[PDB]
Symmetry: C4
Subunit: 388 residues, 4 copies
């Protein structure tokens, strides 16, 4: 039982291969399955787990009505082995309407936020016990990543933001050792309006690609120095931008430094990672709505502003199907650290009004150095077959 | 593995942070979930478990009718990891309409009482086998804590009562080693009625805050010497009293020694713990019924008779929602012993007569030395969605 | 991991204390629960398991119709931790309409009989793999204990019968090492019909109390020598006889040697055990049907022919409620080997014709050297509340 | 833990004894159970697991409609302990409409194929992580064994085919070390079409008996050299042929070398294994459809062309009941390697059109050196009791 250091090079991938799918909504029409949203994946050194925020109810249940609402006291963090759908034997790890989890090589850390919008509490649970907590600092919806945190040599880091809703984002980067907060660093650099960071180890530090909670369709970047707690930040250079809504590729812009003002309505959590000068990224296929999902490599997408040449595109979910939040997780291999991602497949409200609930399933892909084909792996439920 | 000694100082807490919630009743409307009451939480050295007394039936089941009653032969002690709701794969640990459980560092002890009101049997199960038993000594509902027992150096102590619910009874403190009763001591001291003790390690001894069902709305205290088996008892000093029913805050009293004779008949299981001269305690918000739940610190609440200065109040369940029993459990951290509590959230009878059943969910909080905000975490089920 | 030898004295027993109850039938009215019969209990060195023969269906299921029949190809041996009811996640350990199981200290042996009445197959599965098998030797319902087998120093023994249910049959005692049949001994001694033996370790040998289905309401005894494989047999001395049907106590007899010819046809699986000259035993309360269940000690019940002085009676199931098969299991304590028993609580056909199925729950008690009270712990389902 | 080498002789067998049955379809009428097909069994060194390809739905679920189709994006590989039916807590190990799995002594390998018919992807998951992938090489339904792969000394081998189902195709044998493809060998030898290989260790190599879907109703054999990666192939010598369809026993033939051109188009997955010059094999009882299942030894069936002398026949499923795929798995005993097999019991479409779904249960038998009787162990569901 040694601490993870993630001190291997990043795997040099050619694209992604199918890893997992849970079929939650299809099963929900013939079984008792939790209503969820904001899922993610994180792995201990041996095996992977799927997480999501429950809505305190199963789908075929009158309490499923109005589950489009983001925050209620009954939301809890669910945790199963990856591919075990959220059945009634699922453990609720903590009370949470916003969360992040990660394993440090020895045990699990869970960051769980619940309570009043104006005065939330974040609990820090490590190795099965509550070790620390912090209250809201801006009194305006304290929130965190909705994907895995990252630990190096026993110190885990997680990004949180309070006050972005009111246009006064106060973003802080926490450093946590065995559940205890040992340092808090304010955001520094040129990133603004940070929400929902998707972070990954990039030894010796941690790098996050997030979303801008005002009008940037280009994604913020946060760099975390684990040695001295210093922070820097910017925007992804790629002219093929990662958020939705967004302009078409021809009329999209990013200068690597500032938000581009090219998204007019609420954006979506997503991810990307650098490989030298290039950038691997995912995004919705639609530029208007959370439908479809595609991945590709942008040539110069990390280093060159407004870079727009891509290669190695893959469709994950075709544009006739709903997507949602997406995020990165990292998995240690023999010789390298691999990058994987999940896609939230949102069903029900607001897009599908036959039913009165909102829930999701997931699909999960992992980096590969090998070869692969094509397909599309959507949620797959028939909305007309569902309990309403 | 080694026996627990709990020989660390008590954590110096600033209040409590959210830890767990099971949503049992909301789930029961769309899933097969046990009917329960008298829940509690207890942890082995690695992880926490939720316990409750089943009623031998699920909620959506005609057998859930009449479950307001406390004692039937079909009640069994249920045990799951904390946050796993009581689904059909839940283990029934023993036959019990009253119970207590605890882990000594090596194995679980369960104390399970069942049978005739006039002639009950308590079974003592340790490390998976029945080791001892004792029969009723007063022929009037032999009964115990309904929360965790406490073990130091391999000796587990539990408080049991037999006799009148509305007059002098026969309370005994048992000392149990690897499931075998090794000593039994009579209650001594000035407490006049003892039920449903909430006990905690206070090395080298154990301290319990209980329910007086006869003449006191102040809570009795039992002090257990684990070295020589001597017993003392008194009442919590705080003029802000912990039982329900009770007088309002302006007219309630305690003198630390005698029951206050203030709405003293009846009561509810609850808890408190000392910190120096001060007292941390929970209670229902209502002074009349099991409605709402709040915690606070009483300055001088341990040492000073009739102290009423409070600080650090937190609402756990607002007064528009039902509560129920509550109890303490203790969790060993790196440097100190933390105190946590659960609240039973009773739904159905007698308060909600639209349905014919009585069941509960739970919410659980743990001490923190950090900061926190506010909220309310009630059961959350809509009584009108439930099967009757 | 060492082999069990059971080489400690039998525990002092003053009677029995409640240990477990599964509430299977009550749960079946609001949940997906297996239809079963022929249950039993057996423990590995750390924990106990409940076993039963499934009927290849849940109760609330059209396939539950006409499950009164004892042998169909869909019967499988179910195995859960004791107290975990037979939910849909239950493992089916082998195909079986008759079975026995036991743990040798290192791994589980299962003896599983299935197939045609006139040509059945017994499979021997050990440590998760099929190691041996034997075919029917008398072409008339090869069948075994329906309770735990017994292992000493890595050799497990089990009693099996083939041939007439109402006349002379061919009973053999098998000796099995790591799943392999290493010896077979014919039944010898004065027992004239042996079925459904309830066996226990009495180091260095094994002792069984069985069912005579032909000529006796007194129970046969089989003694097994594990050193030279020799077998002896006789009848329990007690004039308070253990089978059902039987004469009333005033006209019932046993001479320790021959079947009593007192309502000697038919019968039910049961148990007893010796303690010096005395006998601890269970039986149904009714002398006509499988109704009620009582235990008591017969003074001289082991050594003295026709002894009828009983003491220490306990009602387990009152005579207004259905019972069924019962059997013994043994549990190793720190200093002695304890004796426990289970009772099958049969519900449905043929006694209860409102429903079309037959199933059971269980209740389980363990020997105690302590004290205890009284009660009754029947199945508890309301036949009117059940799916038919 | 050490790598498996399977370096023990094959167990003596006299026939097969009952091992497991899951009753999936019977249970589906009163419980939430996955719709599946293409099941198989594989064991780690300690215990066995059942696998199958889910259809992304339970049976009693409108999404079960039209699950006769073999490939949709929602198919995932399910894995439970053997005998645990596919309930809602079952883990979906990967996305797959064709699969193979095996344990190398240290960890599990899963080969999972999904995506577009003309451009599928195979993922290779080992020890809980994606290690490699390969894309379709013939752009026509990349597909694999639907039963266990085989590993010797840390190298696992699996047979895969891409191309026509009704003409020459492109079959390759992969060699995989800790999830990484280290070599790929083209099919060589006289086998003209290879699908759905049932492979087993035959130290120092691996031997496979497969399905020729083009010109043969005799089963092809593939021999795999694990040391130098060389491949040979032929046909099973037995004149009693193993595919369906096939000619009757009087007019069927095999010459060991070439497809027999006897009702050679179409087929079903099955198995056989050698013992010296003799052959043990299973097949459907019907020569036309997947009805019934029988096993027998063919004297000289491995070495003598057109041998038809069968002996030691056993009915596994009588010819009034549906069967389906069947396959081999191998289990290491104390001194020898045993051979076992499973039979898929297909219910629903296309044979049973009362219902709109297609699913299966399983029955499993293992080699025995002992004796046995007779029986028939079909699926057992009443099609008239099923949800449609
Ligand atoms: C209770 O259960 C048991 C176990 O399940 C069951 O016993 C099995 O019964 C089946 C059905 O009868 C047996 O399977 C059949 O075997 C038939 C062949 O067996 C005879 O021929 C064998 C081969 O002979 C050829 O080869 C030899 C050289 O090897 C050569 O000399 C011969 O001339 C010939 O060329 C031979 O090996 C075998 O020998 C055994 O028995 C003889 C006595 O006769 C003995 O001397 C030997 O020592 C040895 O023990 C034997 O002579 C085979 O024809 C038959 O297949 C046909 O019928 C089935 C239908 O049944 C058709 O489907 C099929 O298409 C064929 O037309 C089948 O394979 C099986 O062997 C038994 N198992 C065992 C272990 O004994 C009982 O019957 C059950 N009891 C009841 C009443 O239910
Ligand atoms: C966000 O979340 C936090 C944490 O939950 C909330 O802060 C908590 O608020 C409650 C309610 O106000 C506090 O509990 C109360 O404490 C007072 C006692 O303190 C007051 O009176 C003291 C003299 O008796 C005085 O010294 C105090 O002022 C000093 O200290 C405070 C810090 O404690 C500091 O902020 C000041 O600057 C001073 O230095 C203070 O004025 C107690 O009287 C209350 O009990 C009465 O009221 C309750 C109802 O509120 C009633 O039910 C009782 O019967 C009784 O009549 C009560 O215990 C608690 O201490 C705060 N916690 C912390 C850690 O500060 C915060 O309010 C939330 N904000 C929002 C907007 O949601
Ligand atoms: C079988 O599967 C393989 C593997 O998935 C697949 O090969 C891939 O094809 C895609 C599409 O041609 C390639 O990705 C493209 O790369 C070019 C650069 O060479 C880019 O210009 C492309 O982007 C443009 O076109 C996209 C639509 O295709 C637009 O969405 C985008 O906005 C741009 O306009 C795109 O990135 C990919 O590199 C290969 N992968 C590999 C490893 O070769 C193959 O096509 C499939 N076979 C068949 C018959 O379809
Ligand atoms: C949940 O269980 C409760 C408790 O059983 C049940 O409520 C009860 O319903 C029964 C009727 O089924 C009521 O029975 C009556 O009790 C009164 C006394 O209060 C008697 O006087 C009645 O007897 C008269 O009516 C009979 C009708 O046949 C006549 O035969 C008889 O001669 C008398 O005229 C009768 O027995 C009982 O009062 C209630 N109890 C309560 C608490 O309401 C309830 O129905 C169950 N719920 C569900 C959904 O099934
Ligand atoms: C509280 O619980 C205790 C313990 O269970 C219980 O004491 C037990 O009472 C029974 C019944 O009196 C005792 O068993 C009897 O022992 C006498 C010999 O002393 C026998 O003669 C009895 O057998 C006859 O009577 C039976 C009916 O009781 C008949 O069924 C039988 O055929 C015989 O005619 C019987 O064995 C038992 O010894 C005590 N146990 C102990 C440890 O003292 C007590 O009665 C309970 N009290 C209440 C109020 O419920
Ligand atoms: C969950 C809930 O309804 N809580 C109420 C509570 C209960 O209704 C009551 O205790 C049950 O017997 O009632 C409380 O408030 C008082 C009421 O008893 C009264 O009817 O109305 C009063 C004011 O007009 C007063 O509010 C209480 O016990 O505190 C209030 C609580 O919300
Ligand atoms: C659970 C139950 O109903 N038990 C009854 C029992 C059964 O009804 C009966 O044995 C089933 O056939 O009946 C008993 O009561 C009486 C017998 O003692 C008597 O020998 O026969 C009577 C009828 O002729 C009568 O039924 C019993 O077996 O003890 C009593 C019991 O409560
Ligand atoms: C499970 C079952 O019904 N098995 C039948 C089987 C099937 O009905 C049939 O193969 C499906 O197409 O039919 C079999 O017997 C006969 C055929 O051999 C014959 O060619 O045609 C008959 C009239 O239709 C009948 O089908 C068979 O394949 O062996 C018999 C079997 O019990
Ligand atoms: C063994 C037993 O019946 N315990 C019950 C006790 C006693 O009735 C009470 O303490 C008086 O003795 O009351 C409860 O706590 C209660 O009030 O809700 C329920 C609990 O089941
Ligand atoms: C293999 C088998 O069928 N065993 C059955 C036996 C035998 O019928 C009986 O011992 C006569 O031989 O009866 C039972 O125990 C019984 O009476 O309830 C049920 C059991 O299933
Ligand atoms: C990947 C795939 O589709 N495999 C399917 C194969 C192929 O159709 C067949 O081998 C011809 O290539 O047939 C089955 O085995 C079958 O006949 O029941 C079902 C299976 O799902
Ligand atoms: C059970 O089966 C019997 C015999 O076929 C039949 O008469 C009865 O109606 C069935 N019961 C139910 C509830 O379907
Ligand atoms: Ca009181
Ligand atoms: Ca008899
Ligand atoms: Ca063919």
């Amino acid at each position: 039982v040694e601490y993870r250091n993630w001190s291997k090079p990043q795997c040099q991938i050619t694209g992604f291969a199918p890893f997992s799918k849970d079929n939650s909504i299809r099963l929900s029409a013939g079984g008792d399955i939790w209503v969820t949203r904001e899922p993610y994946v994180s792995c201990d050194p041996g095996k992977c787990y799927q997480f999501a925020l429950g809505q305190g109810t199963t789908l075929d249940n009158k309490h499923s009505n109005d589950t489009v609402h983001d925050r209620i006291p009954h939301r809890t963090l669910l945790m199963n082995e990856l591919g075990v759908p959220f059945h009634l034997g699922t453990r609720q790890v903590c009370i949470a309407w916003s969360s992040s989890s990660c394993h440090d090589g020895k045990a699990w850390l869970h960051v769980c936020i619940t309570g009043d919008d104006k005065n939330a509490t974040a609990s820090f649970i490590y190795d099965g016990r509550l070790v620390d907590s912090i209250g809201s600092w801006s009194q305006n919806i304290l929130r965190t990543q909705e994907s895995e945190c990252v630990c190096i040599n026993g110190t885990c880091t997680v990004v949180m933001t309070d006050g972005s809703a009111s246009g006064r984002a106060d973003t802080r980067i926490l450093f946590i050792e065995e559940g205890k907060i040992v340092h808090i660093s304010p955001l520094s650099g040129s990133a603004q309006h940070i929400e929902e960071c998707s972070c990954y180890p990039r030894y010796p530090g941690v790098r996050c690609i997030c979303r801008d909670n005002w009008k940037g369709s280009n994604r913020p970047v946060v760099d975390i120095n684990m040695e001295d707690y210093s922070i820097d930040s910017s925007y992804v250079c790629s002219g093929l931008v990662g958020d939705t809504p967004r302009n078409d590729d021809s009329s999209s812009n990013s200068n690597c430094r500032n938000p581009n003002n090219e998204r007019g309505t609420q954006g979506v959590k997503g991810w990307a990672f650098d490989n030298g000068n290039d950038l691997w990224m995912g995004r919705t296929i639609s530029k208007e709505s959370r439908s479809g999902y595609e991945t590709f490599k942008v040539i110069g997408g990390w280093s060159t502003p407004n870079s727009k040449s891509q290669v190695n595109r893959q469709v994950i979910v075709d544009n006739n199907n709903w997507s949602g939040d997406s995020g990165i997780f990292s998995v240690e291999g023999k010789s390298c650290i691999n990058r994987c991602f999940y896609v939230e497949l949102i069903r029900g409200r607001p897009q599908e009004t036959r039913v009165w609930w909102t829930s999701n399933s997931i699909v999960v892909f992992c980096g590969t150095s090998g070869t692969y084909g094509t397909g599309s792996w959507p949620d797959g439920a028939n909305i007309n077959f569902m309990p309403i």
